[PDB]
Every structure is written in C-alpha cells, then in structure tokens.
Design a protein around this nucleic acid. Structure first.
Ligand SMILES: [K+]
Ligand SMILES: [K+]
Lengths: 80, 75, 99, 98, 80
DNA sequence: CGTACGTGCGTTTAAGCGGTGCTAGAGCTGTCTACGACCAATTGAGCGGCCTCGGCACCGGGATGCGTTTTTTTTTTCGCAGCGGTAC
DNA sequence: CGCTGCGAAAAAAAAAACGCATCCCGGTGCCGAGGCCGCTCAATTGGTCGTAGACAGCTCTAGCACCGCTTAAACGCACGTACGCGCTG
C-alpha cells in the first residue's frame, strides 16, 4: 500500500523530542517521511545486494549490519 | 527628582530634537534617563502615552504602527 | 477554568521523557510494512529475520534523532525555536548527504 | 578617485579566485608552520618538498570547503558576513567537535 | 615559536573568497588559524607516525597521503 | 541606530627566485638468522542443552516538589481633595 | 498654596491555594541471566623447513643554509557605508 503515512505525526514528534526539539513546523512531517524514505531506501538496497550475493530469499540481521557499516552508520548489538 | 505626567513628562526631549521624520521611541527613551527621573516600567508607560496621543490626535505618527515608527508633536 | 499548561511546557516534559528512555518511538508494524514495501523495489517475495527489521528501526530512529539534533541547532542558529524544512536541508547539505 | 561600495570588489575577487586553482597561502610561512607542528611529535624531522605541498593542497581544500559550509550557516541566519559562530556550527554538524 | 601568525589576514581572505564568502568578521582570521592548526596537527601526527613506523627521519608525500586517507580527507595526484 | 568592516592609497616586509655549497639520509645490494608457516597428534577450552531463583518491570497508593491560576499583599507611582503654614 | 497624605491604582510581586505530574515504596510474578552437564573441535606441543627481515654497508637524491635582486604582497590607517542588531506590533 502507502505505508510511509504509517509514520504518524506523533511518531515523528516523539523523535524530534528525543532529539531535543521544543517546537515543530507543520511542513516537517512530510520532509521527515521524505528523508526516512531515502535512508531506508539506500540501506535496504545494499542489504538486499548482500542477501542476493549470498543467494538467499531471507534478509539476515547481518545483511543490514554489513549495509549500515558500508553506508557510514555502524550498529552494535545485531552481531558483527 | 520629579517624573511628571505622560501628558507633560519629556516634552523637552521631543521639542529639543527638531527632526523631519520627528522623534522615535528609542531616541526619546535615551533622553528621560539622560536628565530627568523615571522607574523601570518607564518605557511601557511612554508607549501607552504615545498610543493615547495616536488615537486622539495630540501627537501625530510619521510611519509605522502602535509605538513602532516616529511620532512628532501636535504642531 | 479547566487546568491548562502553556505552549512549550508539555514539549519540554516530552523532551525529558524521551531523552531519559531508550524504547523505539515508531510503531513496530507500520515500520515493518514500510520496510517490506521499500524491499519490493529491489526483489519480490523477500523474507526478513525479525532481528533484521529491528536492526533497521534502531538504525533509522537513531539516524533521524541525530538529524533533528543537528537540525534544532540550525533553527537556534537563525534565532528560532521552531524546526523547519530549510533547517533539515542545511543539516543534510553540511553533513554531505545531498548536494 | 574610482571607489566601489563595500562588497563589489569582494564579488569580483570571488569570481577571480573561484576560476583559478593556484595555492593562496604563501608557501614558506606554510612550510615553517608544518615543521613547528612536527617538532611537537618528533625533533629533527625532514620533509620531501612534495609532502609539504600535498599538505598545502589538503589544507587549502579543507578551509575553502569549510568556508562554503560556514557561508551557508551565515545566510541561514539571514546574514552575509561569516562569524566564528558560523564555522562553529558547520564543524559541529560536520562532526569535527561536540 | 608563533608561525600560525604567518597565515596572513589577506591569505585567509583569498581562501574565503574562493569559498564564495563576500563579508568577513575580524573575529574570523584567529578562529580560522585555530582550525587550520588542529587540521595540520591532526594530519601530521598520523603522517609522522607513518614516517616513524618506516624508521625514516624524512616524512614522505606518501606518509602525508596514507594520513589524509585515514582522516577520510583522501587526496589525488601525489602517489595515491 | 550603531558600528564594524571594505576600499584604496601609502609605507614595511619578506616571499620568491636562481644559483651555489655541504651532507644527512633514502634506499639498494648481499649475507645469514631468527622467526613463522606447515604437519601431526594430543588435549581441554569453549559451546549448545538443561534447570533454578532473583533482579527487574510492574502496579497501585501516598508523598515531594513544580507550574498554573488567582487571591492577598507589598511596594511603587500617580492624581485629587484635604491639610498647616505664608502673606497680608 | 505646596505639600502631603492618602488613597488609590498599578503593577509587582508574592503567596498561596490547587492539581497535576514525577518519584519512591514494597510485594507480585516472570523470564532471562547465570551456572551446571557433557562433548566436540579449535588451541597447544614440538619439530621440520625455507625465507622474511635484520645488518652492514654503498650510493647519489634531495633536502637544509646562505645570498642578495626584484617584485608583489603584507601592513596599516583613515574614511565612510552597508550591514548586524535590537525593539515593537
Ligand atoms: K635521500
Ligand atoms: K631475522
């Protein structure tokens, strides 16, 4: 469907909050959904390449880790 | 140490500063404290006192709205 | 009158709340549905280790939050308190994420 | 008495230097500065002429790029002059300081 | 023992000019010199370390490169 | 509205240049040593099942402090009529 | 009359009352840490081979001083203008 809109206005708020933002423009929610999209896009691609090269049909925690590490964005706690 | 009415407080600063744009709210604020006496609210009382001149027709307003912009004397 | 807090007070309580906690701030399923969507653009009928979805949610939120942080500083830099697209935009331009 | 208004020679100088590629720092001052800074880490060290210029390339590249990032931070705050606080913002966002 | 001051106001201006800056606070030149210091310091540290590990009393262009690369500040045309 | 840059013309400097002279130090060659790869065999360190019990999240129920309103007061700040002393 | 005193009147400001959210207390109850059981495969031993790297020097580069001529920058100061900065509505 169109699941990007499942990233609720309240959700993006909660995230701005943990980031230490007091006040939020209306325009932000769609810019945010905007950027999140490009993040998950660039990351999932490189993940699935790692899935594909491994000749699997199931994306493993490592695929995403290998991906995040690649993209500049290393993650601790899912292995590797 | 006398701080008269807002219908005759710092008329001397306004009239002792002949300008074509007239006197502003800053320039006038910078005279009450350079010769006369005043409190801390002074400025917020000057504003309510230039607003009672703006609506009635005691002191004209060159440009701007409210306190904002220059305000000259009756004549 | 009925009792009421003043614009920006609840926000600040909400900052303290969410900077104290670690729990993920996006709803699990909606995010999952988003992931599997953006996966269909690269291969169909894929599957995902439960753990691979979370590893992304932790990767996404962590990311956004740090952007908001760099954003909120570009708002504050323009004598504001309100984050606006042009603030994010400046972050990403300087971060070197866009041109 | 030909004089131009604060910012018109700037706009020219921008166009002159954006077009060329020569190094803008005088080279000796620069060379010395390196050795000054090398002392800190080891005494009586010697430098390949090319190693120096490689550092001058990197540095002049670094700064010019900062200035492009600084300059936007400035404009972001509805200004046209760059001020320490502009740089400070840039580097903080770039990830050069906390 | 203060060459930093060799990096002349008019030089820092030339760099800012190429960087598209039109107007420059005085408070800038120092802050700049400051940043340059950290940047040179940072790189040469890692440089000389390359030099020291190769038991050489001469720092080589390649030392400077391996360093710039380490710092993610990768440089072309000196032996990459 | 205030002021701190920008231009430009005038003094101060020292970078740049081209060439010369001395020498550390780069960087290669050959020799030979010590160190590490390879193999085999022998082990116990380290891993995937089990089975608790206790540290942790939780919950409801007062208790401390924190923000909101709005009530009472303290302190300042004009303005109107009601004084005590001048003046005559 | 002026002075003054008071009496507001005006904010200040305080205080205090209210009510709301954040903490913490103490007994549940649940699940995952933490600790045993065997057991298996990866680390150790010891010992053979052969070559990477330590050294002892041999070369000739290229990097560090010195040195005035020639400029183009730097320094610098003065004047003035455009910009940064702050207040209000
Ligand atoms: K050499
Ligand atoms: K050896």
């Amino acid at each position: 469907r169109d699941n990007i809109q499942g990233i609720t206005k309240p959700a993006i708020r909660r995230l701005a909050r943990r980031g230490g933002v007091k006040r939020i423009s209306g325009l932000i929610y769609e810019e945010t959904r905007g950027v999140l999209k490009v993040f998950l896009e660039n990351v999932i691609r490189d993940a699935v390449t790692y899935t594909e090269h491994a000749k699997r049909k199931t994306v493993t925690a490592m695929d995403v880790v290998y991906a995040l590490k690649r993209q500049g964005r290393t993650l601790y706690g899912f292995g590797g | 140490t006398d701080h008269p009415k807002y219908s005759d407080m710092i008329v001397a600063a306004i009239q002792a500063e002949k300008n074509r744009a007239g006197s502003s709210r800053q320039s006038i604020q910078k005279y009450i404290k350079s010769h006369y006496k005043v409190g801390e609210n002074a400025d917020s009382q000057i504003k309510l006192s230039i607003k009672r001149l703006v609506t009635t027709g005691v002191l004209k307003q060159t440009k701007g709205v409210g306190a904002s912009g220059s305000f000259r004397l009756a004549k | 009158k009925p009792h009421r807090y003043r614009p920006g007070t609840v926000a600040l309580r909400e900052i303290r709340r969410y900077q104290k906690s670690t729990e993920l701030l996006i709803r699990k399923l909606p995010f999952q549905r988003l992931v599997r969507e953006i996966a269909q653009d690269f291969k169909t009928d894929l599957r995902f280790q439960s753990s691979a979805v979370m590893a992304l949610q932790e990767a996404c939120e962590a990311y956004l939050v740090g952007l908001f942080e760099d954003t909120n500083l570009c708002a504050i830099h323009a004598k504001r308190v309100t984050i606006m697209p042009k603030d994010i935009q400046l972050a990403r331009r300087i971060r070197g994420e866009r041109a």
